[PDB]
Amino acid sequence: DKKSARIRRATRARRKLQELGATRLVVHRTPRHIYAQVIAPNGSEVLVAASTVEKAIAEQLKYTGNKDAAAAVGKAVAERALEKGIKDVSFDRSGFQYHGRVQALADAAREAGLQF
Amino acid sequence: GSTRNGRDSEAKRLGVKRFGGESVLAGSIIVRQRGTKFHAGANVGCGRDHTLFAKADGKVKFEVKGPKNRKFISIEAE
Amino acid sequence: AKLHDYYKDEVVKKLMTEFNYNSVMQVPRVEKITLNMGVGEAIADKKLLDNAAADLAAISGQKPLITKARKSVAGFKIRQGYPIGCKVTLRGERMWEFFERLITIAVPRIRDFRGLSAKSFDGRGNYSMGVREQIIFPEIDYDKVDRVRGLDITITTTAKSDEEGRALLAAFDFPFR
Amino acid sequence: GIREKIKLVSSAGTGHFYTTTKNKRTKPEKLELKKFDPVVRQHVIYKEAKI
Amino acid sequence: PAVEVRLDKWLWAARFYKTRALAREMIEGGKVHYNGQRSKPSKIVELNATLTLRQGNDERTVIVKAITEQRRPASEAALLYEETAESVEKREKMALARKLNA
Amino acid sequence: MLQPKRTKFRKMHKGRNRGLAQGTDVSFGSFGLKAVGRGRLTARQIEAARRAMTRAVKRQGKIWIRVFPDKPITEKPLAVRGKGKGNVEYWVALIQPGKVLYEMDGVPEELAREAFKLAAAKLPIKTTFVTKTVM
Amino acid sequence: MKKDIHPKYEEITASCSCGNVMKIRSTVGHDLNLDVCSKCHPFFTGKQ
RNA sequence: GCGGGGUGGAGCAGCCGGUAGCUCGUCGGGCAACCCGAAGGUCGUCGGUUCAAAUCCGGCCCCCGCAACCA
RNA sequence: CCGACUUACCAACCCGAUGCAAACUGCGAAUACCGGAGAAUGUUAUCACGGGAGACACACGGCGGGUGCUAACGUCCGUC
RNA sequence: CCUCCUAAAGAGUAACGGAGGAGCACGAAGGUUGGCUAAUCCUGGUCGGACAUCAGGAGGUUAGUGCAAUGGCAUAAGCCAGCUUGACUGCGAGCGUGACGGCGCGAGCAGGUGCGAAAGCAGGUCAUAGUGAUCCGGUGGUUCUGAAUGGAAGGGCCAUC
RNA sequence: UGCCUGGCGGCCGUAGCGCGGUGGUCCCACCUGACCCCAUGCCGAACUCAGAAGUGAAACGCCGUAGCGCCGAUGGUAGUGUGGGGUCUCCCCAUGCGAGAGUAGGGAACUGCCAGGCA
Q: Within chain F, how many helices (H) and strands (E) appear? A: 2, 7
User: CB E80: neighbour CB atoms within 10 A?
Assistant: 22
The whole-angstrom separation of Cα E67 and Cα E85 is 19
Give yes or no for F84 touching B (CB within 8 A).
Answer: yes
CA distances from E58 to E23, E72, E80, E91, F15 (A): 16, 22, 19, 6, 83
Output the DSSP codes for C114-130: ----STT--SSS-EEEE
* Residue A25: Cβ within 10 Å count: 27
Q: Are chains B and F in touch, 3+ Cβ pairs below 8 Å? A: yes
Domain regions of chain F by residue span: 21-135
CA distances from residue F35 to F1, F16, F50, F90, F112 in whole angstroms, order as listed: 21, 17, 16, 21, 16
Concatenate the DSSP letters of all residues of C74-100 into one string. Answer: TTTTB-SS---EEEEEE-THHHHHHHH
Which residue ranges have CB below 7 A from strand H?
Answer: B 1-2; C 71-75, 77, 79; E 15-19, 55-56, 70-75, 77; F 6, 10, 77, 87
Phi first, then psi: what are they for E20, rounded to 5°?
-60, -30
Backbone φ, ψ for residue F125 (5° rounding) = -100, 145
3-state helix, strand, coil in chain F (%, to 5): 20, 25, 55
Residue-number span of the structural domain to which A108 is assigned: 1-116
The DSSP 8-state label assigned to residue C103 in this structure reads I
Phi, psi (5° rounding) for residue D17?
-150, 160
Q: How far apart are CA C141 and CA G28, in angstroms?
A: 10
Quote the DSSP letter at residue B65. Answer: E
Distance CA C57, CA C35 (A): 11
What end-to-end distance do the CA atoms of chain E give, in Å?
49
In 3D space, the residue among D47, D7, D1 whose CA is nearest the CA of residue D23 turns out to be: D1
Q: Is G22 on the interface with C (CB under 8 A)?
A: yes
Half-sphere exposure of F135 (CA within 13 A, CB side): 0
Regarding chains A and C, contact by 3 or more CB pairs under 8 A is answered as no
User: Is C104 in Cβ contact with G44 (below 8 Å)?
Assistant: no
Question: Could you tell me if F83 lies within 8 Å of chain B, comparing CB atoms?
Answer: yes
Judge whether B3 is closer than 8 Å to chain F, CB to CB: yes
Q: What is the resolution of this structure in A?
A: 3.0
**CA-wise closest residue to C165 among C107, C120, C135:** C120
Q: Does G18 touch chain C (CB under 8 A)?
A: no
Distance CA F1, CA E94 (A): 80
| Structural domain includes residue B45 | yes
Q: Residue G32's closest chain C neighbor by CA?
A: C138
Residues of F with Cβ-Cβ distance to B5 under 8 angstroms: 84
> Please, where are the H alpha helices in F24-135?
43-57, 109-120
Reading across the β-sheet that carries A46-51, which strands appear in turn?
Answer: A46-51, A34-39, A24-29, A90-92
Beta strand ranges found along D1-51 (DSSP E): 4-10, 17-22, 32-36, 43-49
Q: Looking at chain G, which residue has its C-alpha nearest residue C93?
A: G25
* Chain C residues within an 8 Å CB radius of G27: 57-58, 61, 139
The sheet that has G21-26: what strands, in order across it?
G21-26, G10-16, G32-34
If one counts the domains in chain B, the total is: 1
Instruction: Point out the residue among C63, C108, C177 whose CB comes nearest to the CB of G41.
Output: C108
Parallel/antiparallel/unpaired status of strands D43-49 and E33-34: unpaired
| Torsion, Cα of E25, E27, E29, E35 (10° steps) | 170
Q: Identify the CATH number of the domain defined by range F21-135.
A: 3.90.1170.10
Q: Cα(A26)–Cα(A13) distance, rounded to whole angstroms? A: 11
Provide the 8-state DSSP code for A92.
E
PDB experimental method? cryo-EM
CA-based radius of gyration for chain D: 11
**Considering the domain boundaries, does residue G47 fall inside one?**
no
* Gap between the Cα atoms of E36 and E41, Å rounded: 15
Neighbours of chain E (3+ CB pairs under 8 A): none
Burial (0-12, 13-18, 19+ Cβ within 10 Å), E15: middle
Q: Which domain holds residue B58?
A: 14-78
Residues 6+ apart with CB under 8 A from B71: B37, B38, B39, B62, B63, B64
Chain G environment of C109 (Cβ under 8 Å):
35-36
Does B19 map to a domain? yes
Examine residue G15 and state whether it is found in any structural domain, yes or no.
Answer: yes
Number of domains composing chain G: 1
Q: Which residues of B touch F83 (CB under 8 A)?
A: 1-3
Q: Indicate if CB(F71) is under 7 A from strand I.
A: yes
Q: Is G25 a domain residue?
A: yes
For strand H, give the nucleotides within 7 A of a protein CB. 1-3, 11-13, 18-19, 22-25, 32-36, 47-48, 51-52, 58-60
DSSP letter for each residue of C38-63? E-GGGGT-SHHHHHHHHHHHHHHSSP
Give the type of residue at E20.
Answer: R
Q: Given a contact as 3+ CB pairs under 8 Å, which chains touch F? A: B
Q: Binding-site residues of G, please?
A: 16
Instruction: Decide: CB of A100 under 7 A of nucleic strand J.
Output: no
Which of these, C24, C151, C41, C45, lies nearest to C98 by C-alpha position?
C151
In this complex, is the C-beta atom of F20 within 8 Å of any C-beta atom belonging to chain B?
no
Domain membership of residue B3 (yes or no) is no
Phi and psi based region of residue F106 (left: phi greater than 0; alpha: psi -120 to 50; beta: remaining):
left
Nucleotides of K under 7 A from a protein CB: 6-13, 26-31, 33-52, 54-57, 59-60, 78-80, 89-91, 112-117
CA distance F95 to A93: 65
Neighbouring C-beta atoms of residue F58, cutoff 10 Å:
10
CA E93 remoteness from chain centre: 18
Using the beta-carbon criterion (under 8 Å), do C138 and G14 form an inter-chain contact? yes
Determine the Cα–Cα distance for residues A11 and B49; give it in Å rounded to an integer. Answer: 24
Burial class of residue B50, CB neighbours in 10 A (0-12, 13-18, 19+)? middle
Q: Judge: G38–C104 Cβ closer than 8 Å, yes or no.
A: yes
- Rounded to 10 degrees, what is the CA torsion of C20, C25, C27, C28? -160
